[PDB]
Design a protein around this ligand. Structure first.
Ligand SMILES: Nc1nc2c(c(=O)[nH]1)N[C@H]1C(S)=C(S)[C@@H](COP(=O)(O)OP(=O)(O)OC[C@H]3O[C@@H](n4cnc5c(=O)[nH]c(N)nc54)[C@H](O)[C@@H]3O)O[C@H]1N2
Ligand code: F3S
Ligand code: F3S
Ligand code: FES
Ligand code: FES
Ligand SMILES: [Mo+4]
Ligand SMILES: [Mo+4]
Ligand SMILES: [O]
Ligand SMILES: [O]
Lengths: 132, 843, 843, 132
């Protein structure tokens, strides 16, 4: 009761990620598209030994279009109404129509090398509760 | 990044109370609904238990109506009780079709809530300067003081001693109810000459040029942006500043989504996808988005030298006239054919300061405006090929000899740009010559700023040119100042000098008030008036927050804003709507129209007591108990077709409302006017439009060429998408302030390398007007020597470096500003979290 | 009534991080724990899933540890991450035994939260006055400006040009770390004479009298309130102002709950339930509660005429001495026996202003203080029978000839009352004569205000009497002012005059700064210094919120406060504790000790650049990176027994800590001192206590008799239970502001009837000092002609009507104030919701 | 899931109440002691035709002692630490140690005259959720 109860879900292992190549994932369920991304530099919310593995919702929080990733810029870009998000700065909207910065996963790197997601810092598009 | 950490929101139930709401903010006037329901009741996930009739236990798809963001949710007082509210864009509204901007989508979160602690900055009680500081008091006390001081000064020195600054606009902080109330106080009860508007230092129009020509500035509809062959966007950053007009009407044209519609409404005429000409010295996200939707081949960005628009338009006019690409029958039938002689001081100056340009026939305008492609290329910095291409895109007939339909749109790049009167006319010339007024896919229009909501008594007494109020104040004239809903400290021209003198003059009265006994009110008022006689100023602020200029005022009166009151206004299409009250004003705050009424009543009482019964009588006609009373006394009785409009009737029409003027009422529908001038009869005595003989004469405002020549950088200035106006609400909004704690100044990275500046560095911008601060934001698209600074911003006011320079009609020339830049500090810690990446969408 | 509408709170989980926390606020120093855990994790209802090990799905019984109120919950930043926090009183702490006051119980809710929008008023960045307004900037910039101006002034005019106002207290806004840092800056690096404390306008002690006699003012323990036969409470409203000391220690005595304990520790001595003498002109809720717990027969409320305490005590001393109800062996063994002559100007005046009273032997004190029961009855207004009864309750031996154990406690009714030096001594005389110092059930002590946390270098250079700083400032002297953690605008004496001049003088520097170029810093500093040379003042404010006096300052530096830093202090029992950091400072704010360090470092740099390397060198010894570094350089190296105390060791001792001074360390326990003077060796050169020959000489502060004689009402003043200090946090707390939007003035209902005033009316209080406003609160228990106004309050500052009058040592005589009252306004609308019922509990 | 779900419980009928005589009641369950009270004057949260029927928790929100009612004063009084609450002013703490005003019931008067409680505006003592 009180708070939303987030599940602790395995998303991937650290060995699956290549520098600057986003890995498709879903959290906190099948229907909530996101990505894991290794950025190569220490950044807010980032985990792993280099502190550079982040996880975000990949669905624009304005009107729900799927975001595309620019590798040269390291930004998420929205084809709907031209929003831009920075995963090197906690998903800050560089410019856009969303009243939210990009929802970011609370990640944990296990003992072995598995990456777990245990929460999300903002409301994911298309749901009035992050856990349904 | 700022993150709210709100995992879930209460679901709007099936039985929520629905309110029609127009966006508080920009000209577009997007439609919303506010749903409210008792605190401690809620909706559920099954379709029967929520307002949408949808299963909310499933992820919604893109563009779903069945979702809202945290900033659209709050808890607010309604008839004394806390209620949940969601303020959600309306899918059915033809303006926005469900879109909400980063601004509109946070109306809920920027509303007052004791429960969730939003906007606690909001004023709740009248405040008066006494006992050494600002102190809260009752309305009776505060109004009595304001009335007594005002009445004494006006009796002793005349009404010219009363200076007024007031909104004249629509929407939150304006509207028909509120412009009528203030209007009636200062123009009916009184005859105040020394009055200025919220965005300019005199009681003038922004667009005298177009109006004098017979062409009202809001003549088309938003559908015309969908139907035009070419859109000409001048001095507008529409994606950031008229967001949803651009997204919901311009984009479909550029994408070719409109073709079906174009062919139905205009068969037997060819139609390709829309092309767009953008006239703007700076490459903006608007330019980028057009290129991205239409293709680079269909976007023509004319990156003119700052303030050279008039040269551009004159060249275009000449070329089009010579080629014969003009609506010949429109010119013959609907425009002035009478010759008329140039005034003796032409072309440097008009017949007087009241008339900067010469109104005339097409032929005389062409001869007077004449400029070659080559001369215009020198002035504007454009290539000859670019100017010719523009003329082709505006004037060249389509395949079968059919006239090209062009919608001409302009905003503040033009209106606050060089030679306002003549530039406006030069643009209007193009619309008139090509017959693009009063027809589908046409128009020459303001893309606008605030919504519109003006109705007031005659302003004849004010004069043309009107008094330059800021210069009066800076020069030590005036005794009492009433400030309604604007903040010159952040937003006026020559702002640094203005603040130095305003502080010094209001301080005189503060020191007088601190040293006088308040409980003996006659002694207090005599002390105030003595300070005024010595050159002080007694200042009264009517507002919703503690403002910057309010730190100099002696009385603060708390206003209620849209949503806490019923409010009516029209958008940039003349689309009029009622915003139905859904919450209570915070504390004891009251709507501006009622404040005006209550002030009037106090003036009546006080003057009656003093024994000036004659003057007392002038303040009758303010027995209003609710804002609707102001609507009925103003709009209903005084607007064109007002007899057809009531709250009840507007309510039934919803967020779509109707387009002014009303022409009738049948079967529960106010009948409106889609486009102006469809009959070719214009707003002049004889019904013919006039062209303007408007030759280029350089930078015309005093000081400007001098300022340009003696400083290093252009300090262009304007809006950012996230920030609404002077950040009056945004300064207490973490999402906005987390992104830009300081105002940015967009700088070319090589300009920065040359000056030893790094991203985030705090820099002083300075010139002979004043100085200010901003945060260096590296911007690859910026041209060398050309910076752009966010205007109006509390943590760095760019108005400080704008000169006192205006045109003859006292139009402030903000955009033409030059200055030097130097480093104040290495990037502060509170700026380390910001992204400094490009604002341009990459595909 | 304000209602949060919070239906449920997150449950603290089993694995929450625990922090020891002392209350931020009052002297009692109640124990709390702050529990924190990740946002989006939570506890559950079953015992295994929460910190309490209890089934939380069942209603808890009265006094349960397994519950917390909404004001004890918030969300705060911790090491960069949002976390839940609950700050909950500690059941195991011997101070409070689980109690939390209305103040302490809202530490969480008055903490800074971006997530839940609490205390957004909190400062986040350094601010500097420039470009017409206050503007944010970096630390390097802000510190450079402060250092340059300060250094220039000190070089040109000497250190006397530097004025300082600083906290000297413990707890939030003080503590050992912070008093050391500021102390070291101004007394070690510099030798600032013109320095004042937060609650008084010179660098003096509140209690020179008791100290000069050899009796440190915090000599007992809180257990002694449980063990005394009689408590004598003077000038204290303990239920409202030392709430939990009163509730958790005095009440058990009065109720008879202590008898078991009394008999175990003091067998072979009789014990009845405690009786209490309360010396206070006003009947307070404290008196009501004592009567309600002990019975009216066991409470003796001496409602003395304002400022007549000394008469009372002298009479009591005389009666007790004559009856022989004195500890004869204590007098012979531990007090001065040497005869010593009265100074030539006695009894009107002492040997000098440094020494208002004459220290002496018991016998000489008795002869000098001599006053009959009848003389004291005239002066105090009491009945003879009342004064005799008090003597019996203080001095009369118990059944078997055993001495009566009396704890004498006093606070600001005495300390800010008439003739501070002599009244304090008169009271101490009673304790000394009855042998009630250093023994169980005894003590003559401050009941205190803030917690204590003072350690600083020698203050010898300051002088005695020290400089009256407010008079220097009001007189146009001083150039630069550093204000740390106090707000004279709300809380100084003669405040109306103070504000008028302070504004005028700081305005001079503001106008200079506005007109100068900031980016050329040398020109800016020269402009500041020119304004100072002409009589201006450059003021720097170090604080956590935008303060009132801060509206006059030119630089504001943001502080971190307890909880955002580690902090150490002692309570009124000398009980020292560490408050362990549990959250981050907001924005870029930093602890005061580190601000001081950084300022020292900038002074070193700037003076080095100016070429005064010698003077630069004085500012070394500030290489501190964390608050613990300040603790180790200060307390650890300088306090008595400091070598035994470390953060690590204090942490292991929990909220119970230990009582200072430390005398050793064994097996994880700092060994302390329960009571002072248990050996009968006092704090004088020869180790003997002195009595005080302290004859009554009327109202001694200049102006006071005159002010009384020429005005209608006593304007008594002081605390309210709900309001903490000057409402610096409370002004952004809806629960407090919903209850008292204006400060109340308690008035007898027939006084109100006579004056034509109704409950809630807004009234001006005025006299020859100044004027202010308050809300009439009808108070049946108030005596005719005697009003009580809440002090320190932003919406009506009663300090405005207090005169400049001090005693010889510059102690402000706030409590003796008289003035006239007249109506400003009928009760405002924002006051209609208030209850005006009696504050006294009815059975 | 969340937003606390309050039950709509019958507490009494309007005919049962006498002017200034509190009627013992319990809401939102058996274990949550409160009172209904007819005050004789229109007051905040009050219902019925005269708008004077209020309902409050009777358990002190400071440390949970049962409150006593003074009829002459129209106040609730706490014997624990001397708090005083005003039911004519939304349960405002006139003076006390609670950081809350007295929790008040959201009441509804049915067509037949029955009084229903459908909510509570503040956290009841001894529970971390008003509904257990
Ligand atoms: N996000 C947001 N939107 C708003 C507002 C807001 O505060 N925030 N406010 C509203 C208001 S009140 C207004 S007035 C409108 C303003 O709407 P716009 O006028 O579109 O906004 P601005 O940014 O002032 O100016 C637009 C463009 O003028 C260009 N410009 C500058 N100098 C010149 C010149 O000499 N010639 C030409 N051709 N162009 C030039 C600038 O590069 C800028 O891109 O927007 C409204 N919309
Ligand atoms: S949402 Fe509001 S800000 Fe303008 S674009 Fe639409 S009206
Ligand atoms: S709770 Fe805090 S305010 Fe005083 S009584 Fe205890 S220290
Ligand atoms: S949906 Fe991504 S910007 Fe509109
Ligand atoms: S429990 Fe009611 S006052 Fe402490
Ligand atoms: Mo505008
Ligand atoms: Mo104190
Ligand atoms: O505007
Ligand atoms: O104090």
């Amino acid at each position: 009761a009180a708070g939303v109860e987030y599940p602790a879900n395995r998303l991937a292992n650290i060995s699956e990620l290549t520098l600057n190549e986003p890995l498709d994932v879903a959290y906190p369920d099948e229907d909530a598209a996101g990505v894991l991304l290794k950025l190569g530099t220490r950044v807010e919310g980032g985990v792993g030994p280099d502190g550079d593995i982040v996880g975000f919702s990949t669905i624009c929080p304005h009107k729900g279009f799927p975001l595309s990733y620019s590798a040269d810029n390291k930004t998420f870009n929205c084809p709907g109404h031209f929003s831009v998000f920075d995963p090197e700065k906690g998903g800050q909207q560089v410019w856009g129509q969303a009243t939210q910065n990009l929802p970011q996963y609370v990640l944990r790197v296990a003992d072995n090398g598995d990456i777990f997601a245990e929460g999300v810092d903002e409301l994911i598009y298309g749901r009035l509760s992050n856990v349904l | 990044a700022f993150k709210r950490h709100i995992d879930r929101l209460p679901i709007i139930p099936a039985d929520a109370k629905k309110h029609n709401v127009t966006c508080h903010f920009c000209i577009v006037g997007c439609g919303y609904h506010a749903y409210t329901w008792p605190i401690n009741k809620q909706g559920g996930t099954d379709p029967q238990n929520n307002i949408f009739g949808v299963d909310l236990s499933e992820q919604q798809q893109a563009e779903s109506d069945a979702w809202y963001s945290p900033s659209m949710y709050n808890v607010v007082k309604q008839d004394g009780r806390d209620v949940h509210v969601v303020i959600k864009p309306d899918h059915e509204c033809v303006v926005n079709s469900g879109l909400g901007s980063v601004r509109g989508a946070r109306m809920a979160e920027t509303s007052f809530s004791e429960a969730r602690n939003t906007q606690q900055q909001r004023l709740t009680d009248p405040l008066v300067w006494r006992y050494g500081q600002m102190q809260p008091t009752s309305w009776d006390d505060a109004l009595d003081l304001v009335a007594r001081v005002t009445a004494k000064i006006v009796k002793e020195k005349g009404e010219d001693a009363l200076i007024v600054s007031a909104f004249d606009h629509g929407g939150a902080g304006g509207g028909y109810e509120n412009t009528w109330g203030t209007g009636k106080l200062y123009f009916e009860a009184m005859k105040v000459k020394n009055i200025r508007i919220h965005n300019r230092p005199a009681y003038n129009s922004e667009v005298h040029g177009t109006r004098d020509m017979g062409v009202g500035e809001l003549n088309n509809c938003y559908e015309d942006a969908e139907l035009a062959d070419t859109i000409v966007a001048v001095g507008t950053n529409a994606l950031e500043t008229q967001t949803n007009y651009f997204l919901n009407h311009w984009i479909p044209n550029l994408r070719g989504e409109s073709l079906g519609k174009k062919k139905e409404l205009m068969p037997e005429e060819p139609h390709e996808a829309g092309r767009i000409i953008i006239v703007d010295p700076r490459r903006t996200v608007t330019v980028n988005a057009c290129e991205q939707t239409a293709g680079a081949d269909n976007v023509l960005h004319l990156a003119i030298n700052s303030g050279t628009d008039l040269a551009l338009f004159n060249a275009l006019f000449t070329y089009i006239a010579d080629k014969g690409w003009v609506d010949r029958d429109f010119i013959d039938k609907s425009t002035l054919r009478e010759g008329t002689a140039r005034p003796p001081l032409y072309p440097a100056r008009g017949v007087s300061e009241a008339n900067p340009g010469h109104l005339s026939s097409f032929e005389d305008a062409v001869e007077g405006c004449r400029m070659s492609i080559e001369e215009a290329a020198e002035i504007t910095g454009l290539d000859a090929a670019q100017i010719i291409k523009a003329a082709e895109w505006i004037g060249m007939p389509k395949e079968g000899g059919k006239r090209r339909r062009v919608m001409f749109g302009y905003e503040k790049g033009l209106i606050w740009g060089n030679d306002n009167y003549r530039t406006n006319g030069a643009l209007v010339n193009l619309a008139l010559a090509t017959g693009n007024i009063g027809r589908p896919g046409g128009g020459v229009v303001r893309l606008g700023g605030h919504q519109e909501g003006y109705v007031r008594p005659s302003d004849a007494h004010v004069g043309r040119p009107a008094a330059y109020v800021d210069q009066l104040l800076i020069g030590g004239q005036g005794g009492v100042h009433h400030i309604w809903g604007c903040d010159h400290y952040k937003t006026t021209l020559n702002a640094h000098e203005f603040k130095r003198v305003y502080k010094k003059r209001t301080d005189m009265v503060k020191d007088a008030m601190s040293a006088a006994p308040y409980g003996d009110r006659e002694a207090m008022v005599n002390a105030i008036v003595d300070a005024i006689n010595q050159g002080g100023l007694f200042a009264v602020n009517v507002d919703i927050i503690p403002t910057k200029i309010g730190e100099a005022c002696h009385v603060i009166l708390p206003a209620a804003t849209s949503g806490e009151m019923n409010l009516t206004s029209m958008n940039g299409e003349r689309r009029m709507r009622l915003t139905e009250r859904y919450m209570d004003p915070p504390g004891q705050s009251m709507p501006d129209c009622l404040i005006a009424a209550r002030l009037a009543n106090t003036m009546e009482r006080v003057l009656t007591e003093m024994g000036d019964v004659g003057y007392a009588a002038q303040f009758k006609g303010f027995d209003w108990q609710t804002e609707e009373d102001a609507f009925m006394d103003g709009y209903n009785k005084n607007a064109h077709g007002g007899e057809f409009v009531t709250y009840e009737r507007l309510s039934a029409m919803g967020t779509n409302g109707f387009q002014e003027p009303a022409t009738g009422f049948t079967d529960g529908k106010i009948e409106g006017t889609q486009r102006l001038y469809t009959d070719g009869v214009f707003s002049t005595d004889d019904g013919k439009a006039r062209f303007m003989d408007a030759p280029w004469r350089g930078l015309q405002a005093p000081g400007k060429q001098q300022q340009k020549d003696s400083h290093k950088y252009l300090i262009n200035n304007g809006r950012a998408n996230v920030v609404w106006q002077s950040a009056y609400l945004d300064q207490e909004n973490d999402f906005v302030m987390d992104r830009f704690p300081y105002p940015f100044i967009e700088m070319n990275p090589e300009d920065m390398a040359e000056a030893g500046l790094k991203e985030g560095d705090l820099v002083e911008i300075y010139n002979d007007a004043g100085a200010t601060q901003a945060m260096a934001y590296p911007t690859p698209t910026a041209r060398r020597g050309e910076t752009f600074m966010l205007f109006g911003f509390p943590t760095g006011v760019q108005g400080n470096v704008t000169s006192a320079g205006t045109n003859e009609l006292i139009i402030p020339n903000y955009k033409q500003t030059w200055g030097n830049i130097r480093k104040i500090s290495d990037a502060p810690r509170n700026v380390a979290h910001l992204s400094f990446k490009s604002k341009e969408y990459q595909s």
